[PDB]
Amino acid sequence: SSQIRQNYSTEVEAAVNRLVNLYLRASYTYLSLGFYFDRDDVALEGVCHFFRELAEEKREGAERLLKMQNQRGGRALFQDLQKPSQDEWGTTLDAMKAAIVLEKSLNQALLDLHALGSAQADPHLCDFLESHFLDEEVKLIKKMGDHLTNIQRLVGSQAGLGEYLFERLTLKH
Amino acid sequence: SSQIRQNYSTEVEAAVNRLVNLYLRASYTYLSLGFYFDRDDVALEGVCHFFRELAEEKREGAERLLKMQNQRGGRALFQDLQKPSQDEWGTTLDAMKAAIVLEKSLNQALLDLHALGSAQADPHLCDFLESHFLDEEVKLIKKMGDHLTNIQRLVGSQAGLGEYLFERLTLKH
Amino acid sequence: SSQIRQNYSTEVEAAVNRLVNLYLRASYTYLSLGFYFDRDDVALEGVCHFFRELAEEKREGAERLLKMQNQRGGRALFQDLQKPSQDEWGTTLDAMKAAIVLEKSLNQALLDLHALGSAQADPHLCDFLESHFLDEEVKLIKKMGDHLTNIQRLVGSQAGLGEYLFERLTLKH
Amino acid sequence: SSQIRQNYSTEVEAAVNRLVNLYLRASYTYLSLGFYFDRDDVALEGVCHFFRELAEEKREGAERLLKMQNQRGGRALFQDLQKPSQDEWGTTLDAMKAAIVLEKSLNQALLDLHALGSAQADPHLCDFLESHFLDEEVKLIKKMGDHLTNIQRLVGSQAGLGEYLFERLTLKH
Numbered sequence: 001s002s003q004i005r006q007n008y009s010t011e012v013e014a015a016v017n018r019l020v021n022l023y024l025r026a027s028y029t030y031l032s033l034g035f036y037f038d039r040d041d042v043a044l045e046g047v048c049h050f051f052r053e054l055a056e057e058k059r060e061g062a063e064r065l066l067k068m069q070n071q072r073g074g075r076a077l078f079q080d081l082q083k084p085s086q087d088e089w090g091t092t093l094d095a096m097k098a099a100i101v102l103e104k105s106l107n108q109a110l111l112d113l114h115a116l117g118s119a120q121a122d123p124h125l126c127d128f129l130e131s132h133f134l135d136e137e138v139k140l141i142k143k144m145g146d147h148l149t150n151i152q153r154l155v156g157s158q159a160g161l162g163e164y165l166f167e168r169l170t171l172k173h
Numbered sequence: 174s175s176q177i178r179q180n181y182s183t184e185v186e187a188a189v190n191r192l193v194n195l196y197l198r199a200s201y202t203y204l205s206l207g208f209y210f211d212r213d214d215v216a217l218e219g220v221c222h223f224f225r226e227l228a229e230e231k232r233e234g235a236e237r238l239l240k241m242q243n244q245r246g247g248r249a250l251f252q253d254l255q256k257p258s259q260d261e262w263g264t265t266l267d268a269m270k271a272a273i274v275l276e277k278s279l280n281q282a283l284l285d286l287h288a289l290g291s292a293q294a295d296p297h298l299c300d301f302l303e304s305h306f307l308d309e310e311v312k313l314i315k316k317m318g319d320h321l322t323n324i325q326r327l328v329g330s331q332a333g334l335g336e337y338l339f340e341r342l343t344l345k346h
Numbered sequence: 347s348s349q350i351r352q353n354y355s356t357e358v359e360a361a362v363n364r365l366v367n368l369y370l371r372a373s374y375t376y377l378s379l380g381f382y383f384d385r386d387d388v389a390l391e392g393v394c395h396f397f398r399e400l401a402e403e404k405r406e407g408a409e410r411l412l413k414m415q416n417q418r419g420g421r422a423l424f425q426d427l428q429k430p431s432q433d434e435w436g437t438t439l440d441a442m443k444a445a446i447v448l449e450k451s452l453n454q455a456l457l458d459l460h461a462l463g464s465a466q467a468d469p470h471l472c473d474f475l476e477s478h479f480l481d482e483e484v485k486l487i488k489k490m491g492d493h494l495t496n497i498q499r500l501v502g503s504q505a506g507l508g509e510y511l512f513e514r515l516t517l518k519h
Numbered sequence: 520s521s522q523i524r525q526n527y528s529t530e531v532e533a534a535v536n537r538l539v540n541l542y543l544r545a546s547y548t549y550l551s552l553g554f555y556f557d558r559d560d561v562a563l564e565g566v567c568h569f570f571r572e573l574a575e576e577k578r579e580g581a582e583r584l585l586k587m588q589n590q591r592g593g594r595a596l597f598q599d600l601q602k603p604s605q606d607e608w609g610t611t612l613d614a615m616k617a618a619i620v621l622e623k624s625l626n627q628a629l630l631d632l633h634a635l636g637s638a639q640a641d642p643h644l645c646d647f648l649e650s651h652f653l654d655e656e657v658k659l660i661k662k663m664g665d666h667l668t669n670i671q672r673l674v675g676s677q678a679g680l681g682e683y684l685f686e687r688l689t690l691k692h
């Protein structure tokens with residue numbers, strides 16, 4: 001093992017590699033979400049831009065994990081990326097539910113890794129997660145919950161019109 | 174024939190003149206679309222501006238074909254311009270369908286002319302179409318499809334209100 | 347199929363989806379190349395930055411294919427992304443050979459798709475490839491060949507010192 | 520004890536004083552490293568500047584610990600500073616190994632103090648270490664590992680020439 005590696009367990013190393021995979025899979029899911037909303041028969045540009053920016057954020061998350069892995073003297077291992085769970089994502093409401101579910105799985109993986117670092121007495125790992133991932137997920141998920149609430153309120157009224165209004169007046173375009 | 178004319182078939186020359194006519198007819202259709210939406214009893218300014226800008230684009234297309242015709246040593250021939258297929262264009266939805274149909278006819282004429290240039294081994298013609306017309310039509314038609322989808326979604330909900338919202342929140346004014 | 351789709355064969359649609367997959371796989375290969383060179387026991391920063399920028403370029407390629415797919419009225423389908431062919435990439439020389447091999451596979455897939463568009467008389471497809479992919483690959487591959495030559499010349503002399511000099515004096519850091 | 524002191528154990532107080540001593544000793548080691556490389560018969564200016572900047576960083580570390588000690592109502596106690604372990608530091612490679620060893624001892628003392636704060640339920644201490652010391656050491660040690668790798672690769676080739684190239688092309692001067 002590495003000349004620099006110190007207080008860095010194999011359990012944490014491997015879990016960091018799994019987390020990289022989860023983040024790249026999320027990024028890929030968000031790419032598929034974004035381009036679904038760009039279809040001519042869906043055509044909600046602000047929704048497309050929302051999911052494409054999330055694709056970027058998740059890729060950046062992964063990259064940040066990989067940088068850390070190298071900083072600790074671990075070794076990055078890449079595995080196959082599973083395709084997104086759906087080919088078509090339904091309405092804005094369906095999509096935003098799927099996104100929240102996804103984020104909550106990432107958040108749980110983050111919390112599991114934190115618990116691992118704590119069990120291994122790896123405070124650098126814990127600090128790294130706290131500083132760059134945990135707060136960001138909480139803020140993201142809150143934002144998604146808020147969006148969901150606003151979508152629900154809109155489409156309960158009139159589904160088509162509601163979706164158009166959300167995209168125009170809440171989402172960036 | 175011309176001192177400069179080289180690898181420029183009469184078949185292509187004539188088809189370029191027909192394409193100029195199609196483009197000027199489209200321009201004229203779009204003028205009629207634009208001013209319909211400016212009527213006091215229709216009064217959707219953003220729709221009027223959308224179709225007037227398309228009138229301009231099609232005129233520019235024609236002008237660009239005529240410039241090319243002269244560059245190749247062909248001779249521009251003008252024929253009568255047929256009036257637009259309708260005097261009244263119905264709703265925003267009806268209008269946007271009519272526009273897509275029109276664009277798809279232009280696009281097909283572009284593809285037919287490209288196939289002609291290829292059969293005649295006229296790579297300058299093909300390149301000219303590729304560079305200035307084919308990509309532009311594809312982008313336009315996609316934009317129109319997107320608009321149509323958004324109009325459909327809006328007016329399925331409530332026809333009058335939907336149309337007003339589209340014009341205010343998607344179209345430039 | 348789509349309201350906008352015109353002269354867009356299912357053969358081309360499917361091949362565009364396969365090309366997206368190839369590009370995202372290349373992007374992922376380049377991510378693994380980049381982070382290998384960031385390991386404490388490899389530590390060639392300019393090499394890492396070279397491969398990370400290529401990761402970005404390939405992702406952008408894919409995104410550009412997906413945008414086009416939607417513009418034509420095709421439907422994006424995502425499949426599993428295969429992990430990179432190696433976990434460790436050897437020397438700068440080995441890595442640059444692997445990269446050239448990869449680029450040449452992309453280039454061949456581009457040429458195959460071009461031949462398909464030509465057989466299907468899809469000039470928009472051909473133009474799209476010509477404009478955004480074919481020239482870029484040729485330029486890239488030439489650059490990689492040049493790098494390879496310079497690496498070979500350097501490491502034939504003294505392997506370690508040569509590699510350090512290439513990274514410092516040719517690569518950006 | 521102090522009017523302000525709260526949740527601040529004597530065990531932590533004393534360990535903070537020992538850490539100040541370790542940091543000032545490291546600073547002094549780095550002063551000796553820096554000036555060795557400034558000798559007329561060694562004359563590697565970039566190496567001298569690298570170690571002098573590290574001397575400064577370690578002094579700043581100590582100062583930051585002392586500030587914190589006072590903030591918590593502890594009392595700073597100074598002890599003798601042991602001279603550096605060597606009077607002459609050999610090659611750039613030998614020096615960089617010695618530096619990594621030193622940093623890893625500081626890092627271990629940081630981790631031990633963190634474990635102490637955790638055992639004492641002193642979250643302010645833990646946070647203080649996480650925020651200002653743990654990440655910084657990890658980044659430093661990674662940088663030193665990278666340097667070591669590059670030095671090794673260079674001097675395996677030709678010792679004198681390699682050392683000169685590292686100093687000129689990697690180190691700041």
Ligand SMILES: [Cl-]
Binds near residue numbers: 008009010011
């Ligand atoms: Cl372990």
Ligand SMILES: [Cl-]
Binds near residue numbers: 082083
């Ligand atoms: Cl799967």
Ligand SMILES: [Cl-]
Binds near residue numbers: 123127130645649
């Ligand atoms: Cl913590």
Ligand SMILES: [Cl-]
Binds near residue numbers: 182183184
């Ligand atoms: Cl002829």
Ligand SMILES: [Cl-]
Binds near residue numbers: 255256
């Ligand atoms: Cl008529």
Ligand SMILES: [Cl-]
Binds near residue numbers: 296299300303
């Ligand atoms: Cl051509």
Ligand SMILES: [Cl-]
Binds near residue numbers: 354357
């Ligand atoms: Cl077909």
Ligand SMILES: [Cl-]
Binds near residue numbers: 428429
């Ligand atoms: Cl595989």
Ligand SMILES: [Cl-]
Binds near residue numbers: 476
């Ligand atoms: Cl072509």
Ligand SMILES: [Cl-]
Binds near residue numbers: 527528529530
């Ligand atoms: Cl106590």
Ligand SMILES: [Cl-]
Binds near residue numbers: 601602
């Ligand atoms: Cl001593």
Ligand SMILES: [Cl-]
Binds near residue numbers: 649
């Ligand atoms: Cl903490």
